Each structure stands twice: as C-alpha cells, then as structure tokens.
Amino acid sequence: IIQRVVLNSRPGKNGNTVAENFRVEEFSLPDALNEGQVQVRTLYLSVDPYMRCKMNEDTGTDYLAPWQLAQVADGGGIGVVEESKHQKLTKGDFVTSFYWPWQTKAILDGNGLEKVDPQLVDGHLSYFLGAIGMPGLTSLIGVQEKGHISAGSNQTMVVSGAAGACGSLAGQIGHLLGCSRVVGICGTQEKCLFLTSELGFDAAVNYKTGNVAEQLREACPGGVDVYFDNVGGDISNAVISQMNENSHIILCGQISQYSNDVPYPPPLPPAVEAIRKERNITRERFTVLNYKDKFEPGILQLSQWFKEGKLKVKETMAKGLENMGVAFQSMMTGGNVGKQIVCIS
Ligand SMILES: NC(=O)C1=CN([C@@H]2O[C@H](COP(=O)(O)OP(=O)(O)OC[C@H]3O[C@@H](n4cnc5c(N)ncnc54)[C@H](OP(=O)(O)O)[C@@H]3O)[C@@H](O)[C@H]2O)C=CC1
C-alpha cells in the first residue's frame, strides 16, 4: 500500500545529483496506533537546496544530520490526519513538519506535528511549505533582522536567486519594507521577465549573459545598499564590489557551492574581502531556526500581505512520490520558478 523514498546513493561531496540518488519502495504501515500517535496522509512534500548537504556522509552543518543509505528521506511536509490517538489532533486536521518522511502515509508522533489553518493560505495548503512557511519566514526575518532597511531612505536592494522561493519573496518584501529600488539576478530571460512583469522588481539581471558586473552597473547606478544573497560565488563577488558603505548582506544561502567541497560559511576572496572591510559591509551568518519567537508574527505578517494580494506566491509543481529525485535535481539546476513542490496525493 505505502510507497517511500530512500536515499539510494550519494553523489560524493563534489558530485552533481542524479534522479537515481533516490529510490522508491513499498512497505506495510502498522495498522495500529499506539498511545500518542497519528496516522497521516501526505499531501505535499518540499524539496530544498539544504537537502544537497544531507546527501553527504557529512553535512558540514552541525544542525542537519546526513541521510543514511537505504533509509527513508524526510523534510518539510503537509498532510491530513486520518486516525489519531493524540488529543490535540483529529481526522481531517491539516498538519505540517520539517521532519516529514517521504512516504504516501505515515504514523507520526502527535507532539511532532503542528496543525495549520487553511484560512491563512486561501486554501492552498502547499503555501505552508513556502511563502507562508519556512522559506517566507527566512526572507521576511532575514530582511527585518539583517536588512537595516529604513522606509523612505531610498535604498537599492540586489537579490540573487531572485526567481526562486526565498528570492522572489524577499525582493517583494524588500519593496513593502521601504526600499525604493529592487533588482533581482537570475539564470534566464524568462525568469527575468517574471521578476519585472509579475513581481514588480524594478530590474532583473540575467547572469547567463555573462556580464553581471556591467549589467549591474547599469541597473544599479547608485550602488547597492542591501544584498539578499542566496547564491554566493562570482555572482556575489560582483554585487559586493558594487555595494556602498555601511550596507548589508543578508547571508541567506550560497547555492553555487553546494555541490563543491566547500565549508558553508565560505570566506569572500581576499580582494572582495578587502572591499567589504573598507565600506563597512555587514555580512553575518543567518539561520532562520535561530529566530523562532519571530515565527508567529512573521506568519501573521506574511499571511496578511498574501491575503491582500500584496505578496505574490509562485510555485513549480511536480507530481508523485516517485518523482522526488527528479524534482530535487531539477530545482538544484534551476528548473523551477518560485518554490519547488511535489504533490503527493
Ligand atoms: N538561511 C536560512 O535559514 C535559509 C536559507 N536558504 C537558502 O536560500 C537559498 C535559496 O533557497 P530556495 O528559495 O529554497 O531555493 P530556490 O527556490 O531559489 O531554488 C534554487 C535556485 O538556485 C538557482 N541556482 C542553482 N545553481 C545556481 C548556481 N550555480 N548559481 C546561481 N544560481 C543557482 C536556480 O535559479 P536560476 O535559474 O536563477 O539559476 C534555482 O532555481 C539557498 O541557498 C538556501 O540554502 C533557504 C531556506 C532557509
């Protein structure tokens, strides 16, 4: 009856993922719930860049454990309760977890699940894995805490990985919080058009064209005061070179390095480091799990905006548990616009 996806092989610390890294298998769910458990039917599962690290024997992060071979993978999920021997939850209840196993159905611990209210997302439950969830909180809290945005101050925000989930939301949050100019950098023209025609970014820079330096100059004459960074690498050495004094880098992620033998908090190149030092550019580690008491208000704020249509939510949806592998790989190589999600039932 139940299908589950396990990690079949690892790509090596310096390898690129293949769909085949994951494998589907069938298993029998125990038909009896012991005290405290709930049986849930999986509705949606998330795939996210941090999972590339969990495919390594060593994740390089002390707060992410590696996945083991032949064992079921896991991550952000949203499902519906079917049977429940736990008081706070009953049939039809919608619950979520960041440790949801990649299974059609599961028997989880009631204390490990949080019930979500369909109203906050206009019924689109998959949003709780994105804009109205971890990714949106990362963009909102990242900006509110490391952004030093001052309404009317007339700052310019550069957002990398701008057509991804965190990027598309931050650029928009950027505007709503006071920045007057927001420019996104992404890997392709159609993504660029999405940023300016649907999200409202003032400009887009296609880095596949090959002259990020120059495009940036032109799109940013006046320097960069805020850089929501999702990619790191050359792209970042370029936004930084053009940042102004006392500006800030929200160090959200560095996806360009994930498949290279590289310590997540990599250090800027000597010359680039020199410039950061001179203009006094704040570049501090940012991990959203460190701001837990800011989640409910962040949730209420993001929901509010979404509900007023002030915050546009875009997603790319794949279908079926047997396609976790390919949806994960596809996202890591840019096949998604917005949050990558996989529909499970
Ligand atoms: N600090 C925190 O708490 C959190 C951090 N993050 C980080 O935020 C970043 C974005 O996450 P998320 O919104 O889930 O994912 P995205 O929705 O942004 O999906 C990944 C995107 O990265 C881009 N990309 C892939 N390889 C490269 C490359 N070599 N150079 C430049 N861009 C590349 C692609 O877009 P394109 O077509 O433009 O290349 C791809 O679509 C990640 O680095 C992630 O680790 C996420 C959650 C929390």
Side-chain angles (χ1 to χ4, degrees), residues 66-111:
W67 287 308
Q68 297 299 136
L69 299 170
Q71 290 176 309
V72 60
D74 70 294
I78 198 291
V80 62
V81 186
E82 297 192 321
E83 211 202 303
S84 168
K85 285 192 179 163
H86 187 295
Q87 312 293 239
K88 108 183 179 235
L89 297 162
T90 299
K91 182 153 59 178
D93 275 337
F94 290 115
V95 291
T96 191
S97 179
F98 174 76
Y99 301 89
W100 200 289
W102 292 7
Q103 312 183 173
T104 294
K105 279 178 166 174
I107 287 182
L108 306 175
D109 253 54
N111 296 305

Side-chain angles (χ1 to χ4, degrees), residues 117-123 128 132 299-300 302-304 306-307:
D117 167 35
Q119 171 167 14
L120 304 183
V121 305
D122 280 345
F128 284 118
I132 300 307
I299 291 305
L300 304 178
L302 293 159
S303 190
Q304 205 169 67
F306 162 66
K307 301 184 78 54

Side-chain angles (χ1 to χ4, degrees), residues 163-165 191 315-316 327 330-341:
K191 291 216 180 146
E315 318 177 294
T316 293
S330 166
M331 177 276 287
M332 292 302 294
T333 58
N336 62 300
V337 179
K339 178 77 186 84
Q340 183 65 51
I341 290 302

